[PDB]
Amino acid sequence: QTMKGLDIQKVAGTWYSLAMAASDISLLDAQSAPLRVYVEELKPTPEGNLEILLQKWENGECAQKKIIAEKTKIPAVFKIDALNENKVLVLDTDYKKYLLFCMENSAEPEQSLACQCLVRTPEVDNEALEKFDKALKALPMHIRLAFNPTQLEGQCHV
């Protein structure tokens, strides 16, 4: 599932990680798990690339990390070199409210797939979560997390 129609320019802004799911439990469980990354901002570039600004918990404290995502020939598919991942896929977005994406490594998706439901504002959006759950129905997820507003505000976010 990819958004063939994607205009990356209109995803610019602050976002919050509302829910996360992954194929391997160890990718998400612990607060410092490798794919337990909280998105804070998306910054599209003039050439159609994407900077993903996120925070992680590392050694008991928040730390910022920036991931550079390169456009490819395939719509809504970006390539990265971070977190032992090499792809970012944008499944769907309405631009105004929510965006669904996954990260993976092409060489072993079973052992690397993590997807998120992002929202622009720190509120629970059940419409967005329903679309998220529908989209991963066919995906081999073994852990899923969903956050409340206190957590959206308070989890390593500027």
Residue 146, interface with its own copies (CB under 8 A)? Answer: yes
**Pick 18 or 67: Cβ nearer its own copies:** 18
**Pick 51 or 133: Cβ nearer its own copies:** 133
Q: Is the separation of the CB atoms in 38 and 153 below 8 Å?
A: no
Give CA–CA dist 69/67, Å, rounded. Answer: 6
Minimum separation from the CB atom of position 153 to its own copies (A): 15
When binding is defined by CB under 8 A, the residue of 143, 152, 156, 157 that contacts its own copies is 143
Residue 144, interface with its own copies (CB under 8 A)? Answer: yes
Strands (E), the chain: 13-14, 16-22, 38-44, 50-58, 61-71, 77-82, 85-93, 98-104, 114-119, 143-146
**Pick 3 or 146: Cβ nearer its own copies:** 146
Residue 72, interface with its own copies (CB under 8 A)? Answer: no
Query: Which part of the chain contacts its own copies (CB under 8 A), choosing from 83-91, 101-109, 114-122, 136-144?
Result: 136-144
Instruction: Please report, as a single letter, which amino acid is at residue 154.
Output: G
SS3 134: helix
Give CA–CA dist 101/110, Å, rounded. Answer: 16
Q: Is the separation of the CB atoms in 26 and 84 below 8 Å?
A: no
When binding is defined by CB under 8 A, the residue of 30, 62, 63, 74 that contacts its own copies is 30
Residue 16, interface with its own copies (CB under 8 A)? Answer: no
Residue 29, interface with its own copies (CB under 8 A)? Answer: yes
Q: Which residues bind its own copies (CB under 8 A)?
A: 25, 28-31, 142-148, 151
